[PDB]
Design a protein around this ligand. Structure first.
Ligand SMILES: Nc1ncnc2c1ncn2[C@@H]1O[C@H](COP(=O)(O)OP(=O)(O)OC[C@H]2O[C@@H](O)[C@H](O)[C@@H]2O)[C@@H](O)[C@H]1O
Ligand SMILES: [Zn+2]
Length: 286
């Protein structure tokens, strides 16, 4: 029953059913599993200019690169936003997970910044985008705590750029301090602009955690790696340690070693996320 000869999907379906509540942590693996990849042909097709000039290995690296000027920054990012936010289609695993979660008390924290939850029709009140969203902008000097958006300008930038540069007059500027806008993204050194909406999401997430300090709480970690373990992986480990009745279930095709404190409360499921979620949904629905 509630315990870490069944298939991975059978084991997952049963735990979800049995859980009092689910705390679901989603990282880049879930998007990669639906084909929203950041290395290979998807990246090569979309950015052959930038790859030819900078020898970028992957789209994450390129999205973090300190470009020479804001004209180049916005040429790259406008296209990046269109690929992963304006025009990214619905992923089947986001739809399959949503159906499973419909019958459960749950909350989601995600380090992903793509459109995946929105095109899959999730209630925004149930999701905490701790790393911001590609569709949003912030003052590059973080001069005040407000995010902005303007998809029309993004499309202008895609249309008007040439030679990896947006025309200067199209670069958007913070109305308070006139610094250029940048993507709402968390820097290690400078942090992230966290506006009223961000704090509302955080408070909802913290509320849910406060309500589920006890009981059969399933901490379900999907496609979370080592890139930024401080947001999901490590906090989950700690929650599971602090509640002896919690379980830690990680959906990941690579092995990340689990702390000694929670070895007996942990389960690693290595099946390809898309396949696993699909098979789990099928079982869970019978
Ligand atoms: N099909 C799959 N099935 C199962 N696991 C998978 C699959 N595809 C990828 N994974 C796993 O998903 C994980 C992705 O890890 P990272 O690339 O570290 O992604 P993430 O944990 O989300 O960290 C990314 C960090 O950088 C920022 O872009 C982002 O905002 C976040 O803070 C890896 O452990 C990988 O093994
Ligand atoms: Zn400003």
């Amino acid at each position: 029953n509630w315990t870490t000869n069944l298939t991975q999907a059978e084991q997952l379906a049963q735990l979800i059913k049995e859980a009092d509540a689910l705390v679901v942590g989603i990282g880049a693996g879930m998007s990669a599993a639906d084909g929203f990849t950041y290395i290979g042909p998807r990246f090569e097709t979309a950015f052959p200019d930038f790859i030819a000039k900078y020898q970028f290995l992957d789209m994450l690296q390129a999205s973090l690169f300190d470009f020479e000027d804001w004209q180049e920054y916005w040429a790259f990012q406008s296209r990046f936003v269109a690929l992963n936010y304006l025009d990214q289609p619905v992923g089947q695993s986001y739809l399959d997970l949503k159906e499973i979660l419909e019958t459960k008390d749950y909350h989601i924290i995600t380090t992903n910044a793509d459109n995946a939850f929105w095109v899959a029709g999730y209630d925004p009140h149930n999701i905490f985008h701790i790393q911001g969203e590609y569709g949003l902008w912030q003052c590059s000097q973080h001069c005040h705590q407000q995010t902005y958006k303007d998809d029309t300008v993004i499309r202008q930038m895609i249309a008007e750029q040439k030679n990896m540069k947006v025309p200067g007059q199209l670069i958007p500027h913070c109305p308070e301090c006139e610094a250029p806008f940048e993507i709402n993204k968390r820097n290690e050194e400078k942090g992230m602009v966290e506006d009223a909406d961000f704090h509302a999401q955080k408070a909802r997430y913290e509320a849910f955690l406060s309500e589920h300090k006890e009981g059969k709480v399933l901490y379900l970690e999907i496609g979370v790696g080592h890139t930024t373990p401080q947001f999901i992986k490590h906090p989950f480990w700690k929650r599971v340690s602090e509640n002896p009745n919690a379980l830690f279930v990680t959906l990941n095709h690579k092995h990340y070693r689990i702390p000694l404190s929670i070895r007996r409360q942990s389960l690693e499921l290595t099946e390809h996320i898309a396949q696993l979620i699909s098979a789990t949904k099928t079982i869970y629905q019978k």
